[PDB]
Design a protein around this ligand. Sequence first.
Ligand code: HEC
Ligand code: HEC
Ligand code: HEC
Ligand code: HEC
Ligand code: HEC
Ligand code: HEC
Ligand SMILES: CCCCCCCCCCCCCCCCCC(=O)OC[C@H](C)OC(=O)CCCCCCCCCCCCCCCCC
Ligand code: SF4
Ligand code: SF4
Ligand code: SF4
Ligand code: F3S
Lengths: 261, 929, 157, 104, 45, 169
Amino acid sequence: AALGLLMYLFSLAVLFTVGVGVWGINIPVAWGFDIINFVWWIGIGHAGTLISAILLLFRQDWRTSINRAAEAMTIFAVACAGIYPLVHTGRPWLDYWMLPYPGTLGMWPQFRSALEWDVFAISTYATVSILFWYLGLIPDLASLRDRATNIWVKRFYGFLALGWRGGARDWNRYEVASLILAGLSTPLVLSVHSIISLDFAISQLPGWHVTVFPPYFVAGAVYCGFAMVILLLVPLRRWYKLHDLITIKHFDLMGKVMLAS
Amino acid sequence: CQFALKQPQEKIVPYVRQPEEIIHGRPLFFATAVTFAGFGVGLLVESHEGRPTKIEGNPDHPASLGSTDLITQAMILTMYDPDRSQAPTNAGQETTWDAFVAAATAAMQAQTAKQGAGLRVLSGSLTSPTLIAQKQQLLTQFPQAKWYEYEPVGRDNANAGARLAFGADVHTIYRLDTAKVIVGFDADFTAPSPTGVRMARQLADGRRIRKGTKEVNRLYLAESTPSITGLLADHRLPVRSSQIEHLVRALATLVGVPNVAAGAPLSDTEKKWVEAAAKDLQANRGACVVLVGESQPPVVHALGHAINAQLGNVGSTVVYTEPVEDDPSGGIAALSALTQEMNAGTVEVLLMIESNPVYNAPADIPFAEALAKVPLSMHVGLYRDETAQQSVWHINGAHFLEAWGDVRAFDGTTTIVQPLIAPLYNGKSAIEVLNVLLGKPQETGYQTLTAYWQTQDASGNFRVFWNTALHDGVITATQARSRQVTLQQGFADAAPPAPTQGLEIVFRPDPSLWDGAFANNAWLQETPKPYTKLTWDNVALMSVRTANALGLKNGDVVRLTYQGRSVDAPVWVQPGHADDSVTVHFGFGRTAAGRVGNNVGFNAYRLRTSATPWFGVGLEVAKVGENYKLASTQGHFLMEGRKKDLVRYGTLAEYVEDEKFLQVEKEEPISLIGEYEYNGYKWGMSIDLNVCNSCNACVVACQSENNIPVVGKDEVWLGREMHWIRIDQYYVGDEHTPNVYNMVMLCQQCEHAPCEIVCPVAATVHDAEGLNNMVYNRCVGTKYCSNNCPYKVRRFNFLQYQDVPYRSPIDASTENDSIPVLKMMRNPDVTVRARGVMEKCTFCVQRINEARIQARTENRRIADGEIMTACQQVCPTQAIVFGDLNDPQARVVDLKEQPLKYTSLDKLNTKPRVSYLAKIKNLNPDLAE
Amino acid sequence: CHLEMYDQAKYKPQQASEIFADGASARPLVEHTVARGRLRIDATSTGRVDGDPNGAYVTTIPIRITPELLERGAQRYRIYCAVCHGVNGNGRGQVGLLLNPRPPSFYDQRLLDMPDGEYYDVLVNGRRTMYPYGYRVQSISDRWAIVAHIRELQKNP
Amino acid sequence: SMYPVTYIASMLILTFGGGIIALAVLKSRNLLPFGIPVDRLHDLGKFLFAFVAVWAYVNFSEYLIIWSGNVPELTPWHGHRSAGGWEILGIVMIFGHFLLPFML
Amino acid sequence: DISLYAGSFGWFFFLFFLFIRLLPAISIFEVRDLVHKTETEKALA
Amino acid sequence: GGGFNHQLHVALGMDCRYCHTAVEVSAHANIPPTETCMGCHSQIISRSEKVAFVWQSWETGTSIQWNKVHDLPKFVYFNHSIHVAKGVGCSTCHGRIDQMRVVYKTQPLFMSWCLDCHRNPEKYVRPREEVFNMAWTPPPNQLEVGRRLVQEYEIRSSWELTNCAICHR
Ligand code: HEC
Ligand code: HEC
Ligand code: HEC
Ligand code: HEC
Ligand code: HEC
Ligand code: HEC
Ligand SMILES: CCCCCCCCCCCCCCCCCC(=O)OC[C@H](C)OC(=O)CCCCCCCCCCCCCCCCC
Ligand code: SF4
Ligand code: SF4
Ligand code: SF4
Ligand code: F3S
């Protein structure tokens, strides 16, 4: 995985230095792998929150074992999807221009193009599926801290789990913060891959202006996402001895939600 | 990747002594001309501050009525070409100029004891009056010296067929102002030929379809290779080019010419074309013409005058005059006459001025090996050509924007070539070189130019004439006077030979690269060839029938073996082409062109014969290749049912009966997205596709004006050509003989621009004047705008496209280092785009802003003809018309009301601001079906 | 910060050059060329009887002196000449008092009978000490308007 | 497309809004065979609320698509339903259909 | 494009293998529940 | 060398168009050549080390390499002769050049400053005649006098003047 990262940071150092045109993108098709993999990688991350957040609405319990192995699967599928809209631009250094800021020249981002909603969907999807994931960790990082029996390891998790303490009232504030965040990451990922759906459907192209892209890109993101959840849990269930937690009924139900999508 | 907390301390250098004419920040157009084939074109070049920047046509010149050619437009890069010669080379070793005069005047004193016996000269078909007059001083100071004129493409047959039919030599001047029926056999007259611009406008001026037009030219073309005349041709016929020589003999027997004695029966469809043409020339006798191209043998040009004088075209349409060039008896026969003299060691001083025959030799005339059999062989060329590799001396060229010379266009209208800049490298042009041979070395070019024109000016003063000659450029006082002719018959009494069977290689000059003298020009090389949109490749074009016979594709690499010599050429199937015949392009494979045309393969000059120099029937194809790149820009060459959105076609048979016969009646389309009002200047364009002959001069005019970067062939095959304006061939139906239509595609400047709502940082926005503003600096390179653009006009600087033939764009060590010589050809009011920045045809805002601001400064409004876009005043046919739409008396708002007016892709309401006119193509009743 | 197109490979109206010996990017015009708008062979564009350099000068101003041109002349004379010939033409400009062959005042009999050609000849080609103007005025309308104002300065000594 | 999908998202408002309506008329008159648990009535309320959000997600995205790229073949639907008085029923869909029963 | 997409799985698994080793790869208190919920349902039966 | 103090030179009565002749006629306000500086300094203070740099530029063909202080980014395409013609005096963009021994930037050329007068010219538009009058302080009622000069000059609206093509051509 690290040698694959050295291929990542070298295909980026070659891209920044030589240009965005080492990609084989033509002028008719200016959007190639850089956007096929952006919509794919962000599509993977959407069924990691359908497990972590959308199933919390339905109060279902086949989500508990597959919670973090999918919620943390979202973030790292956004950390590889949040780079393509920051790197497929021909001038990546001016990617702060897609953000609203008083910047000594009266230009602001457009707010009519879905590449301007993307930087508002991807940046929200990042810093909400990170906080909802870090929220789901403070109780666990308190379990890792109390069971560490190793100074500077107990301090590491003791610093991440801020002061968790358990708590009768700290758990009620958690149950409402986790429900509302689940109730906010349900329309978020219904809109993040719907906004990513709209960087095709607002164009007058024949194969792109299909109006049913929002409830079909979302359905495609949940479709490709559960495939990646299964691809990453069959090894985590087999190699890591988690047969007593991620039971085969989780895959029976993930295979059905991957079918309903 | 450049980065800095502050941009460097940019310096402001003023003049040391500012001229009384240079106002900093203003174009200051000049008036010069360019020797294309010895004949002038009459330019009007943008001289910003001493240096030229943009070449435009001189509206007072007959050879170019305000619009330039394709080669002529891109010859501002040929000047600002870093591969241009910068110092003379003595035997390859770089040397000074004053060392040449030491060893050139020492050769004249060695050529004076002998009465100038070995002072042969190989200029190429010069018509310059001051160069003719110095040729006269050289041939009387050295009486035995000879001056062989060799141009590889020039009038070798038309000038030898003119004296074959008339006795003495004549110079015909075809006029298409009054020509209802043109029948030009192999006539590529709307071509880079010296009369190409005028014969494109005078032919387009006949097919100006309007609200009430009923009579239009017909132009029967009869040509083996589809050419830029076949676009305007209404009945083009793919002929073998061996039948043309007796396809005119059939027309010269229907028209009554006494002793033609035709032979070699034609065809079922070539004969039906020659009866319908002759039955169309007998009607409207006085207003018609029978043109003949250069590829035909001299006996055909003799018949071209046998029919023109039979239809009474003399004095009306065809005008014979005194020969503008000095001697028309030179060319392929004069090159062989000198080469047989260079053999056996007769030549001692061989000044090859601009011909470059070591490359241009027909491969039967062994000039490469005949050279170096002489002791002293000079050369004065702007590029170190394949002769400079083999010649002893090589004087720098002094490109025509740096040389004090003159030209003489067709009909004799001399134009003083006017140096805009002093030569970047020490020039020493053809006049400053003969001054060394004549014996007056220290006498500059301007000194001899007035020392000749003070003799030729007998009327009035000189400074009232010389400056008026320099201001207008056109002197129009040496107009070639008419000449009574006789047309002595019997020239066709010789029977035509037995028709030879076999595939025929027809030798053709390349539209873009004429004869290889401009192969290092990256602008007219990246420019796509007209019918086959290839850019950096010479190919063997075959018809679809004569390639399915050989089992050939669009990418194979055949080995054309014609009379012993093999060339190993690619292949590109061309639907309009003729059966069992291939064509070639002149001037591609140059071992020493420079850094641009240095290895663009398939040198087609090594297949000629000097007896069959334009077409021959002894070819063996025998494919020996599998796959080639063949970077073409278009892609699909078929109107995929998308007529009414692409170029709409029709015919005058159904235009007189219903003017609005292709304007679809559609209701006002509903648009949720507001509506904005443009009460200021409403900048709109009206293209007339009826007259867009794909000259590709508008493609280079947008490059010369908008600093558009050349792209390598490796990145054009990837579909990354930077061309804001493109012409689209579409090949409707019957892939053996398809009609071909052009829709020159540029940025429509859509009012409901879909490419604007899709820029995240809001770079590309619309204007209050009404044209999509691409802002190259706010562009972060998202490149989404092209995907929303319905026409895919927006081109993206994917890599650092800048000086690309001089630095491969896939590097980055030099992508911030710019060639200092190239920085001058760039327009000082158009952004030189970096990488990662999309661009598009901006209606030349560099011309709208500089003219509106000049209008607001003077508190007046913009005149109708004051803002001409770069592609509008370069189109010879004047297809593109740009102007205010709110000005009711404008040539656009009176041109968008025509019944042919339509916009591309009106099914999606972009409200395009350019509105093409349909292609009405005047079919004959008894020839169509 | 990113200098992408802050410095471009093109020569703006004034900036240094790395190809020419005197880095200018503004090359001198070739000596005897005539531009499209600058003919300068008549009695108007040069103050000579027919444009000949060995001509006889022009006694009256060739262009029609409209009343809106004298206010253009008095404004142009106040720019160029007045800094060194004085605002009222008596050669007492703030710089004129510092030139060693002090600029000759008007209103003296030497410069009244001097024709409008000389007043234009020195305005375009200068004198033995006055450097050539006309690359500063650069417009025949304002070139003769200055001569017109000096023609009316001498109307009140 | 998504014209048959914007009905599906509105088929689920009627059958859930009707589900709470019919369960209330049966419980107001005391006709139900089971007392409605106040936490599972909150489930029908969460379904009804989530489907006003889905309905506004499918009707607006159908409009945001057709409005952005206004191809005159997809436009005449929202064009005729935004002019001549139909915009009064259009601004009710934005405020009285989504924004009022989303805040409530 | 291949050396960036196939290298993007590096940046995915560089973080996903760091998450497994550093953080609990499966929720603990959410699996403490559904164990307290299974005993609460087994209590009635 | 020498530096060319404007304060000393304009104090001699130089009307700011003696040098910079191409203003009010061209897009680029030109810098005077060596012949202008040598128009007086051929005998004013010749043989002085302060002015021996125009003589070094007059005898030698080299032109003076003036350091540019107002450095626009070459993709913006400023245009004089339309600010000077529409009543935008030489101040308010260059500051008081009459009190500048060395020319420095006064307005930082932000494009929030160029658009500030393009979106609202009445706050800075002055009479056409008092453009080269550097002592021009805006009146207390700059608006409703600059508002009146906008219709007098027909200066275009904030919608036509801030639309990506005025600048950035
Ligand atoms: C200071 C640099 C001057 C400027 C500004 C102008 N003039 Fe001048 N002028 C100057 C000098 C030092 C002289 C003396 C010439 C000599 O013989 O040394 C002059 C002279 C003239 C003359 C008379 C020439 C003659 O031979 O009598 C004229 C008619 C004249 N100057 C005109 C003139 C005009 C029109 C000017 C504005 C463009 C102008 N001068 C400016 C110094 C200077
Ligand atoms: C006549 C109108 C002049 C023009 C044209 C130029 N300068 Fe000048 N300069 C002039 C005077 C009368 C003086 C002062 C005389 C004295 O004895 O000091 C100057 C002085 C300078 C200086 C020195 C400044 C100081 O304080 O000593 C410099 C550096 C200078 N001038 C530069 C300069 C340049 C670069 C010019 C061309 C743009 C130029 N001067 C023109 C009068 C005139
Ligand atoms: C000749 C004596 C001049 C007069 C009169 C005026 N200016 Fe000037 N200016 C002159 C020179 C030789 C230079 C370049 C030298 C330097 O120090 O920069 C300038 C420069 C400017 C600039 C800045 C140009 C830049 O590099 O960005 C400005 C803004 C300027 N000048 C303004 C200005 C004004 C308002 C004037 C009338 C009072 C004026 N100049 C007169 C030469 C001369
Ligand atoms: C704001 C609209 C301005 C007004 C009013 C004046 N100037 Fe200017 N000036 C301005 C800018 C933004 C720049 C730099 C732009 C560029 O690309 O150069 C300048 C620059 C100059 C220069 C130097 C130009 C160069 O060397 O390239 C000069 C000589 C200059 N300005 C003179 C000048 C004068 C005399 C003015 C009063 C009429 C004047 N400027 C007004 C902005 C503005
Ligand atoms: C107020 C003092 C201004 C500042 C600051 C800038 N500009 Fe300006 N500009 C101003 C006026 C009153 C006008 C006249 C507009 C008209 O149509 O008459 C202008 C005009 C221009 C133009 C040309 C207008 C056109 O029709 O193309 C340009 C190119 C321009 N201005 C450029 C420009 C730049 C780049 C500026 C920032 C450095 C700038 N202007 C500032 C007033 C003012
Ligand atoms: C004249 C009033 C302008 C108008 C209209 C527009 N721009 Fe501008 N722009 C102007 C100036 C003087 C500058 C220089 C600012 C600086 O920092 O020196 C700019 C710069 C920009 C930039 C920055 C480019 C960079 O490489 O940093 C951008 C992105 C830009 N301008 C965008 C922009 C757009 C999109 C405009 C039309 C909607 C536009 N500008 C108009 C002057 C003027
Ligand atoms: C993956 C990222 C995106 C996440 C999702 C989206 C959320 C975005 C949240 C807001 C963050 C946006 C960051 C944009 C930074 C733009 C600054 C910039 O690029 O300056 C450009 C220029 C080269 O720089 C300059 O001109 C000046 C350079 C020096 C200052 C650099 C400051 C950079 C900030 C770091 C602060 C370091 C301290 C600096 C100390 C002083 C340094 C001299
Ligand atoms: S529009 Fe283009 S292709 Fe057509 S004639 Fe003009 S320049 Fe040539
Ligand atoms: S025609 Fe293409 S480039 Fe031009 S405005 Fe429309 S979408 Fe943009
Ligand atoms: S208007 Fe000018 S820039 Fe636009 S396509 Fe035509 S030539 Fe090119
Ligand atoms: S969509 Fe946007 S930022 Fe650049 S290339 Fe295309 S414009």
